[PDB]
Subunit: 163 residues, 4 copies
C-alpha cells in the first residue's frame, strides 16, 4: 500500500493535480475511484460522492487507487486513508492544510504523518500577483466550513493576507 498528499491554499491547482496523479494509474489499467465532499453516497461520471469515507468503504472495496478532493471535510479521513493503504491501496489525497484563519483544517494535519509523500502547492496572489500560499475569505464571516469559488475567497501572498 501507499499514501500521497497534496496541499496548499485554494486556486493552487489542487484538485487538478489529484486527477492527473490518478489517471496515471488508471491509464495503466488500474482500479481507480474518486471520493469527494457533497454536503447533503452518489455516483457521477465514474467517481463517487460522500460525506463520510466510512460509508463508501464497502464498494470502493475493490479499487486499488482512491482519490479524494477536499479531504479535510471528511472527519474520518486519517484512519480511512491509513487503514486503506494498509490493505495495499494507493490513496491520493488533495486537501487544504489551513483555513481562512490559517488554522489547521479539521484533523487533517494528522494525516501528513502517516503519508509517504506530501507536497504543498502555490497559487498566484490575486493582489500583488506573486506566489500565493494562503487562502483568504472576502466576506466578514466566521463558521469554518463554507464552500465557494473566487467570488468568495482569494489566493494571497503573506503581505496581502494581513487585512
Amino acid at each position: 500500500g501507499h499514501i500521497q498528499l497534496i496541499i496548499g491554499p485554494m486556486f493552487s491547482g489542487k484538485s487538478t493535480e489529484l486527477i492527473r496523479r490518478v489517471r496515471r494509474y488508471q491509464i495503466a489499467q488500474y482500479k481507480c475511484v474518486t471520493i469527494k465532499y457533497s454536503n447533503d453516497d452518489k455516483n457521477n461520471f465514474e467517481a463517487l460522492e460522500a460525506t463520510k469515507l466510512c460509508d463508501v468503504l464497502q464498494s470502493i472495496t475493490d479499487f486499488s487507487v482512491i482519490g479524494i478532493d477536499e479531504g479535510q471535510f471528511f472527519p474520518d479521513i486519517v484512519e480511512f486513508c491509513e487503514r486503506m493503504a494498509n490493505e495495499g491501496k494507493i490513496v491520493i489525497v488533495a486537501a487544504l492544510d489551513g483555513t481562512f484563519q490559517r488554522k489547521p483544517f479539521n484533523n487533517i494535519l494528522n494525516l501528513l504523518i502517516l503519508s509517504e509523500m506530501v507536497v504543498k502547492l502555490t497559487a498566484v496572489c490575486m493582489k500583488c500577483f506573486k506566489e500565493a500560499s494562503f487562502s483568504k475569505r472576502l466576506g466578514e464571516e466566521t463558521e469554518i466550513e463554507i464552500i465557494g469559488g473566487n467570488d468568495m475567497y482569494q489566493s494571497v501572498c503573506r503581505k496581502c493576507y494581513v487585512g
Copy 2:
C-alpha cells in the same frame, strides 16, 4: 517575462499539468491562450510563428506537444522576453529515446524545468520512457495507448 517547462514520456500526465499550471494564472484574471499541434491522428497551429500576431495580447501561453514546433525555442524565448509567461509541455525523447526535434535546446533558456513519471505498462513501476508497439520508423507519428507504452528501463529493452 518567464518560461516554464514540463517533460517526460507519454501518459506522464503532461498535457494535464500544463493546463493546471495555466488555470492558475487565468483564475487570477490573466490573458491566457493555448497553442497545440494540428493535422494529427485556445488556438491551433503547426508553426508558432503564424499565430504570433493574435496571441500578441496574451500574458500567458500554453503549448502541449511543443516538440512538434520547429520554431519552438526562439518563439518561447522571444515571447518571454516580451514579458510573457510561456508554459511548455513536450516530450524530451522519441520512441528511440533520442532527443525530439530541437527541443532540448529550449531547456537551457528556461526558468523552471521538470520531468514527470508515468506508471510502467509492463512491470507497473515508475515509467520514464516511451516505447512504440508497432514495427515502425518515421519519428513523428501520433497515437494513444493503442500505439505506445510508458515503460521502465528494464522494460524498454525490446
Copy 3:
C-alpha cells in the same frame, strides 16, 4: 517575510537540504544564521550558526539576520510562533524537522507550523530493509519516551511494509 519547510523521516537528507537552501541566500550576500538543538555529531564560510533549546532566547541576537535555518525544529516547543513572528518581520525562516515520531505520531506541536508556511516538502529516504523509498522512521530498541537522539545505530528508514514490527 517568508517561511520554507522540509520534513520526512531520518536519513531523508533533511539537515543537508536545509543548508543547501541557506547557502543559496548567503552566497547572494545575505545575513544568514543557523539555530540547532543541543544534540548531534556544520560546514564552512562566514557568519553562520548558534545553538539553543528555546528559539525565544536567541531572538535578541539573530535580531539582525534576514535568513534563519533550524535543523530538528520539532525539538523547539516555541517553534511555531517563533518562525511565524520572525517571518512577519521580513525574515526568511527555513525549517528542517520531522513530521512524525517512531510511533508515526506528529512531533511536538510541529504540524501546526505547516499551515502558516509558504512552501512545504517531504523528502524520502531509502528503506534499510527492502531498499525502496523509505518514508518513515523506526526505532530499533524496545524504548518509549518520545525524544531520544541517535544515528543509524538506533533508528531505521523504512518503507510501509517494513514499518510493521
Copy 4:
C-alpha cells in the same frame, strides 16, 4: 539500474544536492562513489580516497570504469565536463547501477553544455534548481560570466560568475 539528473546555473546548490542524494544510499549501506573533474581545480574559503567520502577523480569517465566496477551508486558533480558522459551513465545504469549526475545545462552564453542535454533523454528523473539572483535578488536561473572572456570551459567561483534572473542576464 537507474539514472538521476540535477541542473540549473551556478550557486543553484547543485553539487550539494548531489551529495545529499548519495548519502541517502550510502547510509543504507550501499557501494557509493563520486567522480569529479580535475585540471584547474580549486575553489575556496584514477585512485580512491576519502572526503566526498570514497570519491575518485578523472577527466574521462571511461578510465575509472574498471574500479568503480563494484559500486552500485555513482555521483558526478560537473558532468558536462566529461565528453564520454552520456554513454557512460547510460551503460552503467544498464548494469543495475544508480547514476546521480549533477551538471550545468547551459553555458555563460546560455548554450547547451558539451553533449550534456543528450543525457536527459535517457534519464529517469531530471530536475532544474534555482539560485538567487546576485543583481535583483530574485530566482536566478542562469549563469553569467563577469569577465569579457570567450572559451567555453573556464572554472570559477562567485569571483568570476553570477547567478542572475532573466532581466539581469541581458548584460
